[PDB]
Design a binder for this molecule. Structure first.
Ligand SMILES: CC#C[C@H]1CN(S(=O)(=O)c2ccc(N)nc2)CCN1c1ccc([S@](=N)(=O)C(F)(F)F)cc1
Ligand SMILES: O=P(O)(O)OC[C@@H](O)[C@@H](O)[C@H](O)[C@@H](O)CO
Length: 585
């Protein structure tokens, strides 16, 4: 029937109360799962939220139980990390002809970029040619834009890979897809397997291969799952690898920018750093060198989240500035600045928030006086500015910019990383009466730039900014239980996520939910057969331009009414959030 080709794979809605026993829940990829710790997130206060997300992030480091999924600390995963470090060594010994590519869509692509830079520095600080590069769905501009649409083409991913792999003789392709989902990566991995003599693909993500995405890619014949299963078979001969620890669901369902991007770093910085630091020691990377790093990264979570109350406050003051209708600025130096930008930009698609709502800034790259003259004029009593720096940074360039902002603002707070026994110039740096001093132990680094110190600092910031940004929006009431209902369908995964949220919250059949969704998307046109049968990219291209598509669809379902009637009902409610919330009653 028209549509069946497209919607066949979708699991039926279960009857009330049989969501577990239908086997439905056991088939939701871990990355899409609702996290039980966050079922009441929409009611938690700011301090709760910080605790719950703190807890969620902790699950990255939790160990495997006694029938269950491999995790980060499991032997199979660490053993895989060792082998892979092994393969990076082969290339590090033979840079003439060698390349290492880190690739992903969205936040996986952001993380890819950061890491490509860091390990490029490391080899430069040693006067080796850099061997690392990145790829991001939608080319380099994607790094700092919201561009959720660009991950849906395998042919794209393969092209970007063909470019950068020039006439290199040995390429290592680390494809990052938290959900084992992005068609962009799928093409890259599949290409590599078709040319083993040059390419070595390493797939990274956080679902078991049996939960890997399995719907058809529009421009490609194989699914992510087949690709991944085939890589796993090649692992027995050491010509492909799959690194896929479970780290548990996101605190905000399907928000893989969070735990997923963090685990992406934890996992890859660990493994590559190991490979580097053990080559010039003339010694294979072992689990013991990796574990050192993982435990460091695990200390870092505890270090970070012990500043919880102060974190909870910054959230409260980001919430307020947006609750009024102010803006929030995230101002940071070197790499921490970048990560500030990345968090801000992600708030656009993740929350439907405007690019001014939470904006990042590096000294987007608007330098000292340029910030003084450009952005400074437009500050306001009710805004919030956030400063993010180490003590190694240049605190003159910092004190000046804060000195200025104090006048036009007063809601300033800061994020200062420091070795122990570094002191904060101006004992009246108050200015900041209640800093977020994150003071690090002294660790035993040997490479010139102290790269482990860097990775700690990045991760810790990411955790803070993510927890803050996400938290602030929850407090505003924009999140439903632990789901972002009112997302903008801008790729096929978000289309599927929308459909799943309609089944979840309404309890109504696969076919009704699909119908209401497609009606909501294409209104005022009605369901033709062409539309039913149309590929998911056609729905996406039309929905991406609309507002409240999902809430309208859900309302049509709950009231069993037309799109005309549910739109009218929406417009006559005080807000989207109350309309939906009380239709659920
Ligand atoms: C329809 C449907 C569905 C699934 C799978 N889609 S997906 O894009 O096809 C996908 C994405 C990743 C992956 N590994 N496999 C499949 C992504 C969204 N997804 C999903 C999301 C949430 C839920 S959920 N547990 O019902 C709740 F929304 F409440 F979390 C269930 C399924
Ligand atoms: O790494 P994945 O599963 O392939 O997802 C890639 C991107 O869709 C994803 O990073 C998304 O942009 C983020 O908003 C998730 O919160």
């Amino acid at each position: 029937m028209p549509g069946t080709k497209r919607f066949q794979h979708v699991i039926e809605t279960p009857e009330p109360g049989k969501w577990e026993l239908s086997g439905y829940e056991a088939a939701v990829p871990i990355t899409e799962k609702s996290n039980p710790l966050t079922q009441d997130l929409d009611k938690a206060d700011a301090e709760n939220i910080v605790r719950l997300l703190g807890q969620c992030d902790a699950e990255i480091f939790q160990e495997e139980g006694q029938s269950t999924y491999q995790r980060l600390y499991s032997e199979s995963i660490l053993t895989t990390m060792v082998q892979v470090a092994g393969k990076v060594q082969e290339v590090l010994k033979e840079p003439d002809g060698g390349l290492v590519v880190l690739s992903g869509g969205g936040t996986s692509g952001r993380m890819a970029f950061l890491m490509s830079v860091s390990f490029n520095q490391l080899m430069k600080g040693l006067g080796q040619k850099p061997l690392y590069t990145y790829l991001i769905a939608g080319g380099d501009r994607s790094v700092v834009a919201s561009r959720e649409g660009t991950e849906d083409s395998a042919l794209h991913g393969i092209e970007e890979l063909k470019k950068v792999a020039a006439g290199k003789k040995r390429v290592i392709v680390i494809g990052i897809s938290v959900g084992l989902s992005a068609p962009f990566v799928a093409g890259q991995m599949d290409c590599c397997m078709n040319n083993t003599a040059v390419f070595l693909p390493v797939l990274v993500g956080f679902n078991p291969v049996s939960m890997a995405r399995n719907d058809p890619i529009e421009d490609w014949s194989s699914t992510f799952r087949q690709v991944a299963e085939r890589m796993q078979k090649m692992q027995e001969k050491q010509k492909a690898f799959v690194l896929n620890p479970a780290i548990g669901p996101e605190g905000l369902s399907g928000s893989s920018r969070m735990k997923g991007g963090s685990a992406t770093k934890i996992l890859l910085e660990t493994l590559l750093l190991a490979a580097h630091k053990t080559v010039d020691q003339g010694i294979a990377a072992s689990q013991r060198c990796l574990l050192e790093i993982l435990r460091t990264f695990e200390r870092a979570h505890q270090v970070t989240y012990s500043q919880s109350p102060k974190i909870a406050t910054l959230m409260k003051s980001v919430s307020t500035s947006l609750e009024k209708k102010g803006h929030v600025y995230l101002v940071g130096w070197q790499t921490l600045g970048i990560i500030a930008i990345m968090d801000g930009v992600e708030c656009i698609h993740t929350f439907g928030a405007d690019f001014r709502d939470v904006r990042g800034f590096l000294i987007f790259t608007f330098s000292q006086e340029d910030f003084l003259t450009s952005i400074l004029p437009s500050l306001t009593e009710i805004d919030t500015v956030v400063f993010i720096f180490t003590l190694d940074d240049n605190l003159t360039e910092v004190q000046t910019i804060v000195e200025q902002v104090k006048e036009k603002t007063n809601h300033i707070q800061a994020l200062a990383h420091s070795t122990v026994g570094q002191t904060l110039p101006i004992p009246l740096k108050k200015l900041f009466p209640s800093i977020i001093s994150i003071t690090w132990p002294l660790l035993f680094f040997e490479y010139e730039g102290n790269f482990i110190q860097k990775f700690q600092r990045e991760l810790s910031t990411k955790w803070v900014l993510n927890t803050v940004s996400t938290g602030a929006h929850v407090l505003l009431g924009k999140i439903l239980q632990n789901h972002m209902l009112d997302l903008r369908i801008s790729n096929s995964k978000l289309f599927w996520r929308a459909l799943a949220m309609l089944q979840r919250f309404s309890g109504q059949s696969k076919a009704r939910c699909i119908e209401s969704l497609l009606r909501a998307i294409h209104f005022p046109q009605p369901l033709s057969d062409d539309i039913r049968a149309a590929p998911i990219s056609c729905h996406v291209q039309v929905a991406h331009e609309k507002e409240q598509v999902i809430p309208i669809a859900l309302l049509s379902l709950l009231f069993r009414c037309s799109i005309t009637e549910a739109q009218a009902h929406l417009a006559a409610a005080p807000s989207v959030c109350e309309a939906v919330r009380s239709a659920l009653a």
